[PDB]
Paper text:
Here, we report the crystal structure of the UbiD-like protein PA0254 of P. aeruginosa in two different crystal forms at 1.95 and 2.3 Å resolution, respectively. P. aeruginosa however contains another gene, PA0254 that shows less, but significant sequence identity (24%) to E. coli and P. aeruginosa UbiD suggesting that it belongs to the same sequence- and fold family as bona fide UbiD enzymes.
In addition, Gly220 in chain C (monoclinic crystal form), located in loop region at the protein surface, is not visible in the electron density map and was therefore not modeled. The final model of the asymmetric unit of the monoclinic crystals contains residues 1–494 (chain A), 2–496 (chain B), 3–219 and 221–494 (chain C), 1–493 (chain D), one sulfate ion and 249 water molecules. In PA0254 crystals of space group P21, there are two such dimers in the asymmetric unit, whereas in space group P3221 crystals two subunits form a biological dimer within the asymmetric unit and the third subunit forms another dimer with a subunit related by the crystallographic two-fold axis.
Author numbering:
A (entry chain B): 2 to 496
B (entry chain A): 1 to 493
The structure:
Amino acid sequence: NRSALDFRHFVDHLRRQGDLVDVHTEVDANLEIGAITRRVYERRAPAPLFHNIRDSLPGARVLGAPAGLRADRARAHSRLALHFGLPEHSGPRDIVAMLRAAMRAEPIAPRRLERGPVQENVWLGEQVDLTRFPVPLLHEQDGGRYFGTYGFHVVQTPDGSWDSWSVGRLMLVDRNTLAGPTIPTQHIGIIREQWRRLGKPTPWAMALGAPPAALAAAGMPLPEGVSEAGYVGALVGEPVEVVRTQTNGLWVPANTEIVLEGEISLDETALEGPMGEYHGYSFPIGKPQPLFHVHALSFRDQPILPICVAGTPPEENHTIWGTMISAQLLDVAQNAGLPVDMVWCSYEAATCWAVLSIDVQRLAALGTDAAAFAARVAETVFGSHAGHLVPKLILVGNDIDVTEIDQVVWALATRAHPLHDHFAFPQIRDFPMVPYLDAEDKARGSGGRLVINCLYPEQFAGQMRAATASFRHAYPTALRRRVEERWSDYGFGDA
Amino acid sequence: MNRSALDFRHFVDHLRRQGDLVDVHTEVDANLEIGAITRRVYERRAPAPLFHNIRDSLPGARVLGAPAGLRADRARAHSRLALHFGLPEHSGPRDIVAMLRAAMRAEPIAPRRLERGPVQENVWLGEQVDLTRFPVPLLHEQDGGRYFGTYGFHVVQTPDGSWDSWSVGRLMLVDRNTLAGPTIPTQHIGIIREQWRRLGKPTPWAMALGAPPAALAAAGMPLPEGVSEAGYVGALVGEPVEVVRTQTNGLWVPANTEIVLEGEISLDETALEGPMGEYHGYSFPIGKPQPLFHVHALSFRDQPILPICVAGTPPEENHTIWGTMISAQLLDVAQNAGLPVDMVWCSYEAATCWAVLSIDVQRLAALGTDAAAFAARVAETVFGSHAGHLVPKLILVGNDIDVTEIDQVVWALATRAHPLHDHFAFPQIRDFPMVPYLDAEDKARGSGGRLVINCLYPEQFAGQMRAATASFRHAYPTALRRRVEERWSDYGF
């Protein structure tokens, strides 16, 4: 709870539980930091807090892998769980039930403070130089250095009636200019347009090293006019504390490590990217994006710049956003009357697929078949904001545990018939970032969507052609419990 | 590792010696419990269990479960499996594959004939034969009977004695001295059965259980008709298997075999056999009539060990032995054909229902082909072989990934296989009949289950790649990777 609301306390928390390594060695923000953090995701090592970054502002720090996973199976997701207030042994299923709970908790208004820690140091106008920060070049093939890879943008509607928080990347352009994507169909883009329809640039701020739970809220889809900041309070049962910015009347979390302030240019662009992205790839060509002019910034003493070195799994895009998507999607399916009892975007599939666990008893009641169930499933799923982001759906019965990739592969290989179980929906619009889309797909706007059925035909009539020959399903309950409790007297200890 | 490879008893002491064997002294039940533990052993990837205290069974008789299952330790995960091919504990997929292919090219060594062997320490003749006295397990709840043979092979010899055969096979328990199990009509044992049947005679037979680890594996070699498995043990481990004559029918069986059965495969008698959980992870509900195997005598070692396979969800002996052996065969089929494949791997996790083919994209580009042509080509070549006949689905991916690691194959499949272009079905190529997802239309057509999934990006056929990979290995220069690994403890890890 104190970790969810305070990034610095979040860090001392990880240190306390031994999920942090303090790197005292001088490291280089040119590639080295990224290379270390990359190996950290892949080896599932403690999160590194880099204490000495070459040629940087003295005291400026960097936190790699803020939601990477741990090598400990029992505590694998403790870092990621900590962004939701959740404890060390929280698994996928614990975190989803927590997430669907939050999704129906009353939001709590952000507590307004006069003052805060992010205000300890202020740079105004000409005193602003972003290059003084340990700004990393995260992958050797990136088209520049990224100031923002672990924060959200803050913008407000012209009449001030509502706030938006949204995650995005920001490339370092120069000492007081950044640039990055701004999606028109989203709250930030929608609000830009409101200031455009007034002839004005958009007042902006970015929070970096914001409360872990504030980062989390900054990704949830919500109706226009609705503010993300109250859903921190829904998540953790406590309001996020905010202070107004120095410059532009926006509200930012009191204890953010670094806040940038300024405006998003109406017309100015810079060639932004490319960057190695969540899907595991680094495309070679960048595209123009709006300039972000930094007119002022402020930071806590010894500011920690958290980063995300995106790529092959598992990194924060899979761990944080994949997990949240799986919750929202589980909530979307149940709501519309679909026989789904769990959804997991396997980290190993880099958020390019979500697996749907199916209660085949409830499925039998629908009196339907694969093609029809597959079409109905696609519309519900892809017609939502979370499911717009995942191009492939796998429908499997609930005898397997869909958080286990090994079990999904078994079902995938043994149940999906080449002739009957491959349902393309090439007219459902794509999420453009999907790596396998070709030029025809992108010009058209669709072609990438697909549902893969692993639900045997007789399963729709509530039947099954064969029992699963596993420990769980091939032996009676009394025997299984006998073997479980007696396991260590057999001579196994811990298998 | 040839002493473990050529002697089951030594193989067992070895496993104990390394911490890969648990001696169960708790009294257990041959009814389901033995299998329930062993099933859990495969799945948790625990040390192999040696069962000493079995309810109402022959004293001194023990049981070994998970003979070739995996270990939870990632660096020695394949050690138990590797002992079967006489390999070191740190052996893995590619090491074992390269070992197999060399062995397929290696010359057989004639099995060494002994007059006596430990398998003769106990002999039961005729009415003394009571197969029920062994701790014969019921392995899964929905099984149609108890299984005596799930980790051993049949010995049959051609009527003129110019060659014999070793074939792995399941034998259900029928009564005192009768078993039943499938005789594949096209295999060496069905071929020979037919050879004796044209003489109006049943087929003299034996089964070796607790046979040398390399003998069991050699039974799965690709051999033309007229050639014997037994000499390919020597192909495998550089040493010949030692063999003695059976007590009653003049057949050759390995000398140190834990338990040997002797008798004949009936001409026309059947019993309803099965069902049983099989390699694919499922236990189908119906039993099928299968030939009788009259056991007229059996011999066994002092304190015999009966190895078992509790077949089902991966990874178990079907996947780790036969799966590993198939991948190697498929690597040969592909390379002998001209396909730009540097590795094939039948993912254990996929229960031998797929093989991931590692494509060399520099070599692919030279072909000047496309997805549809390549797919069809790889398909005729692979499914047209004896090994590839047994695998319904093939995945084609670039060799930038380890096709050996399932998490990388999954990444490749999710991010590179396109729903509209890369799903090439081959509905008219004969199926292997046991693939779990077929339907009655398929089984009556005899085909319809085959597929090649293509994860080669379209540009890879011209030699390009749309995007680099964002990982530790591929987003950073070698020099910097080296520094990070060198300074790893310096950073404070």
